């Protein structure tokens, strides 16, 4: 499935973050990278440059403590879809607020932050 945001996904080394918003994958403004709404769910793609010129991928779906079932479910499904889109080359990581992996936390130079709130559920 070729979603507009999928076309942009993992094109070059770097970090891309999208927030689930009413059953869709919405890009997060770059200036806000690291500020996570605890009532939301997000999808993070870390693209790393490889020897052969091909990129290495790690897909992380972050789940806020108050995110609704539709958001966490959509985060999980979008992750599988992106991975499929990237030819199954991404390692998927489930990241739960307050229990994030060292790898994930390390993506944020200044340290990631949590803010209360988020977009309403799509149900």
């Amino acid at each position: 499935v070729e979603h507009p945001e999928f076309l942009k996904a993992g094109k070059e080394p770097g970090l891309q973050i999208w927030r689930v918003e009413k059953f869709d994958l919405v890009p997060v403004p770059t200036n806000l990278y690291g500020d996570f709404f605890t009532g939301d769910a997000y999808v993070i793609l870390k693209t790393v440059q490889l020897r052969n010129g091909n990129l290495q991928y790690d897909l992380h779906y972050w789940l806020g403590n108050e995110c609704s079932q539709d958001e966490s479910g959509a985060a999980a499904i979008f992750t599988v879809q992106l991975d499929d889109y990237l030819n199954g080359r991404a390692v998927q990581h489930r990241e739960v607020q307050g229990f994030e992996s060292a790898t994930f936390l390390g993506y944020f130079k200044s340290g990631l932050k949590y803010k209360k709130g988020g977009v309403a559920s799509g149900f």
Partner: protein, 364 residues
């Protein structure tokens, strides 16, 4: 903007609704009733309440459709009477049991397009939808409904076929078992209305003991575990250790004279059939789903049993969502609602062009 429908066909209950809703609009028994001796047929609640003059049939056994004419009747009723929609106006997501025979997948597909003229459809594995509903792409789902129980290991969104195991023991068998042990206590429940009472007793007062033995000990020594149940007239019965002896069969199928292993061992066995590299992720994400996993105490007991089977270093995590009775349907509601669903379904065009077999390439 089109509205997709979600239909979860269960052996005992069918769940139908609209994609985008957080719960099925209709839940009803999977039964087709027809004049036993001589409307021409009924489905669901009405068939059940008119059982006095109808002969009831269950088209789905162990999660697999065994009678296509009756299944069609159930779907027809679902669209026109339960959901009150014209199927030709809606993409339809249907669910299937793990390891659903190839022929059935094609039949389901053929019926939707040819009989119902759906503009588009999709078939998802029940267990996988349940995992998604829990917000995970990896884990092992323990799905136990009315007719069968499955252990389904899933990695990065896809079930692992070779590791799926099946336990032919589920809600129906527990209800029947409750009927039997209740007679030892003198209570005879044999009619349909009586079986309903027994089912209600199972759903209302049964529970899984953390330690069975110790629980029997307890029950035999004091009247601490007994509970009262008021029957439909006014009679009040007293239920003792039957409350936990009933669901205990899930862990000790021998209670039903079955040779197979209990649910905890089946889960452990499925995990062991998977690559060592991903077993950690399975032990840490055991997701329970289905009506039969609704007994209080089942999570704790599964945690205990799995912990005893796995190395002590392995972190065991049993996830038991309160909404597990409908996890599959909810998972389907979410999937069908995605801005990307649009492309994943089989369209009428594709069906006309490739025929039923297209389901093998677009739904896997």
């Amino acid at each position: 903007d089109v509205q997709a429908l979600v239909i979860d066909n269960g052996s005992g209950m069918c769940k139908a609704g609209f994609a985008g809703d957080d719960a099925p609009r209709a839940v009803f028994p999977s039964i087709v009733g027809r004049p036993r001796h001589t409307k021409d047929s009924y489905v669901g609640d009405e068939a059940q309440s008119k059982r006095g003059i109808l002969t009831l049939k269950y088209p789905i056994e162990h999660g697999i459709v065994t009678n296509w004419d009756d299944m069609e009747k159930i779907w027809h009723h679902t669209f026109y009477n339960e959901l009150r929609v014209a199927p030709e106006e809606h993409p339809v997501l249907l669910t299937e049991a793990p390891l659903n025979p190839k022929a059935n997948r094609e039949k389901m597909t053929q019926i939707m397009f040819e009989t119902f003229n759906t503009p588009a459809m999709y078939v998802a594995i029940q267990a996988v939808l349940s995992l998604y509903a829990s917000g995970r792409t990896t884990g092992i789902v323990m799905d136990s409904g009315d007719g069968v129980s499955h252990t389904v290991p899933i990695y990065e969104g896809y079930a692992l076929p070779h590791a799926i195991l099946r336990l032919d023991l589920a809600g129906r068998d527990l209800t029947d078992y409750m009927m039997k042990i209740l007679t030892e206590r003198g209570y005879s429940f044999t009619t349909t209305a009586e079986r309903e009472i027994v089912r209600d007793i199972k759903e209302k007062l049964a529970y899984v003991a953390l330690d069975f033995e110790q629980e029997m000990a307890t029950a035999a020594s004091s009247s601490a575990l007994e509970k009262s149940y008021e029957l439909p007239d006014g009679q009040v019965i007293t239920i003792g250790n039957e409350r936990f002896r009933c669901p205990e069969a899930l862990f000790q199928p021998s209670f039903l004279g079955m040779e197979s292993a209990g649910i905890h061992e089946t889960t452990y066995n499925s995990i062991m059939k998977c690559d060592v590299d991903i077993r950690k992720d399975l032990y840490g994400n055991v997701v329970l789903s289905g009506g039969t996993t609704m007994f209080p105490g089942i999570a704790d007991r599964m945690n205990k049993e799995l912990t005893a089977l796995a190395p002590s270093t392995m972190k065991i995590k049993i996830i038991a969502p309160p909404e597990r009775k409908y996890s599959v349907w909810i998972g389907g509601s979410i999937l069908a609602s995605l801005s990307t669903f649009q492309q994943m379904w089989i369209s009428k065009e594709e069906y006309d062009e490739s025929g039923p077999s297209i389901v093998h390439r677009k739904c896997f």
